[PDB]
Design a protein around this ligand. Structure first.
Ligand SMILES: [Mg+2]
Ligand SMILES: [Mg+2]
Lengths: 317, 316
C-alpha cells in the first residue's frame, strides 16, 4: 500500500515527499503516497508572461497546495530563476555564464520589491497549513542573514496590518553551491533545515554544465566528492538537531537509495511516480546493512566502483 | 631583499615563484628574486593566429624560459583555453556556460592531436633545464590517468626517435575544480604535486563568475570554504610527502600571506612585482605565530571578519 511507511525491517523510518512545479501536481503526489512536498518550485508563477505575478496570484497558488496537502509539510522554494529564462519584463542582463550569475537569491536580494511580494504570499498561505520556506543558491551564512532580515521586515508589516501567518514557520536552504556544503556546520546554526539540491551541487562541484553535450560525461553524480559533501551536510544538520532532505534527482534514484538511507538522510523528495520504487527499497533493506554499505561507498576512490556496488545491491533486493 | 630567502625568524622557509604568460616575463621575475616559475601560462602560443602553434614554435618558447631560469623549476601549465575566447581556427562550440564547458584538459583529451604536440614540446624542452608539467581543470583522478596515458605514448614516441627528455619529469595538477580539492587525498597518490588555482577554485566553489558585474561581490577569496579547501589540499599533499603550491591571485595577496604560511603552503607563485612584499611579510612573522593566526582564521565564520583580522596582522 501507498500508506505503508518507508521503514526498514529493523525499524528505521524516513520521509518520502514529492517535488512539484504547479498545484496540478498534487493529486499525483498523494496518489503515490507522498508524505509532503519537499520542493515546491515557484518558477511557474514568473514564466510565460509579461508582468510580475501579484501577491494575490502567488497566494492563491500556494494556498491551494497547502490546503490540498492536508497538514503535510509543503516546502516552498523562493524564486530560483535567472536571465537565461529570458523573461521580457524581468529585464535581466545577458551573461557569459548565467549558471554562475545573477539569479535566484541574488536577484531577490538585489530586488527586495520582488522578494517581498513572494514572501508576503508564502507567509499568508502559512495560515492555512504546514508551510516551510527554502532559499535557493545560498553560498554563505551572510546571505541567509540578509534574506531573513527581509523576511522579518515582511512579518512586521503583516503584524501591523493584522494579517496572520505561522509565527513558527521553518526557514531553511537549498544546499547546492559547494561552499554551502563545505560550511554546512556554520549554516546549520542559522537555518531550520537543509535540502540538498544534488543536480546543481554536482554541476558546480565538478564544474560541468550537464546540458552541454560536449562535456556531459563529466557530470558524475556518484563522484566521491559528491558523496562526501552529502555526508557532510547530513552530519552538520544532525549535530544541530535539524533535518536533512534531498530534492535533487539522486533522491529518486533507486541506486542511491541505500547509500542515502545509510548516511542518515531524513527526507527524500522526488518526482511522485518514483516514490513507490524507493519505498520498496527502504522497506527491504536493514538500516544496519545500509550503514555498512554507505561506509563501503565512502571508502571507494572511483564513481564507477560505487555504481557497480550499488547495482549489485539493487540486484540482491 | 632580492637574494634574501623567504624565511621566518624562527626558520620556516617557503619558495616564492613567478607566474608568467610569455618568455618576455622572465627578466622581471628574476629581478624580483623569483626562485622559479610556478605557473607558465601557455595560451599566448594559441592566441592571435589563424592556425594551431607548431611543435617547434612551442618548443622554442619553452626552451628559452627553461634556460633563462638557470636550473630553477619551471611549472608549465598545459592548454587552459575554452570557447569563451574566440579563436575561430580552433572551432570550439558555442556554449551557454563556457566556464563549465569544453575547455582546457577536456579539450585536450578530446583532441589528443593538439595535446601531443604540446606535450612533445614540453618534454623536448625538459632536456635543457628544470621542467614540470601541470594539467588544468582536473575534476577527478580518472582524468589524470587519461592524460598520463597520452603523455606515456608521447614519451614512447620520443624514445623510439632517440629524442632526449627528462625521465624524472614531475607531473602535477592545478587544483581549481571543487571536486579535486574535496578528493585531494585520492589525487595525491597519483600526482607529483598540487598547485592551487584559487581564482577559479573561488569562482566554482561560490558559483560566481567574478567578471559578471551584477554578482562580483559574491566572489570572496576569504570565504571560510575556500580556506578549508586550501588547507585540505595542502594537508593531502603533505600526507603523501609531496609539495603544495598556489598560483592563484591569493598567493600574491599580503592579507593572505600569514594564513598561507601558517597552513604550511610550500610555494607561492605570483605576479613578479608582488614577490618582494610577500617576502617581507614572511621574514617578519614567526612561523609559530603564523600557525596560531591560521588556526584563528580557520575558526572564523565570515570572510569580512577574516579580512579585518588580517589587515591588523600585517598593519605593522
Ligand atoms: Mg538548483
Ligand atoms: Mg584556472
Amino acid at each position: 500500500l501507498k500508506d505503508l511507511p518507508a521503514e526498514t525491517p529493523d525499524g528505521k523510518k524516513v520521509m518520502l515527499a514529492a517535488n512539484i512545479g504547479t498545484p496540478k501536481d498534487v493529486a499525483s503526489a498523494l496518489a503515490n503516497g507522498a508524505e509532503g512536498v519537499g520542493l515546491f518550485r515557484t518558477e511557474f508563477l514568473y514564466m510565460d508572461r509579461n508582468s510580475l505575478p501579484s501577491e494575490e496570484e502567488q497566494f492563491e497558488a500556494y494556498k491551494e497546495v497547502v490546503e490540498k496537502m492536508g497538514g503535510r509539510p509543503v516546502t516552498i522554494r523562493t524564486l530560483d530563476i535567472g536571465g537565461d529564462k529570458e523573461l521580457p519584463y524581468l529585464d535581466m542582463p545577458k551573461e557569459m555564464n548565467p549558471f554562475l550569475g545573477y539569479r535566484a537569491i541574488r536577484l531577490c536580494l538585489d530586488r527586495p520589491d520582488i522578494f517581498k511580494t513572494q514572501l508576503r504570499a508564502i507567509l499568508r498561505a502559512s495560515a492555512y497549513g504546514n508551510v516551510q520556506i527554502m532559499y535557493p543558491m545560498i553560498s554563505s551564512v551572510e546571505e541567509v542573514r540578509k534574506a531573513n532580515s527581509i523576511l522579518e521586515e515582511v512579518k512586521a508589516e503583516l503584524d501591523r496590518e493584522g494579517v496572520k501567518y505561522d509565527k513558527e514557520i521553518k526557514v531553511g536552504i537549498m544546499v547546492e553551491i559547494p561552499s554551502a556544503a563545505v560550511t554546512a556546520d556554520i549554516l546549520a546554526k542559522e537555518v531550520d533545515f537543509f535540502s540538498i539540491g544534488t543536480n546543481d551541487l554536482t554541476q558546480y562541484t565538478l564544474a560541468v554544465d550537464r546540458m552541454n553535450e560536449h562535456v556531459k560525461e563529466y557530470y558524475q553524480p556518484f563522484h566521491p566528492a559528491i558523496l562526501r559533501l552529502v555526508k557532510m551536510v547530513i552530519d552538520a544538520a544532525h549535530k544541530e538537531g535539524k533535518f536533512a532532505a534531498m530534492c535533487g534527482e539522486m533522491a529518486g534514484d533507486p541506486l542511491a537509495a541505500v547509500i542515502l538511507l545509510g548516511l542518515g538522510l531524513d527526507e527524500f523528495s522526488m518526482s511522485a511516480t518514483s516514490i513507490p520504487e524507493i519505498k520498496n527499497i527502504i522497506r527491504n533493506v536493514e538500516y544496519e546493512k545500509a550503514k555498512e554499505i554507505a561506509e563501503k561507498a565512502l571508502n571507494m576512490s572511483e564513481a564507477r566502483e560505487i555504481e557497480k556496488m550499488m547495482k549489485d545491491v539493487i540486484k540482491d533486493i
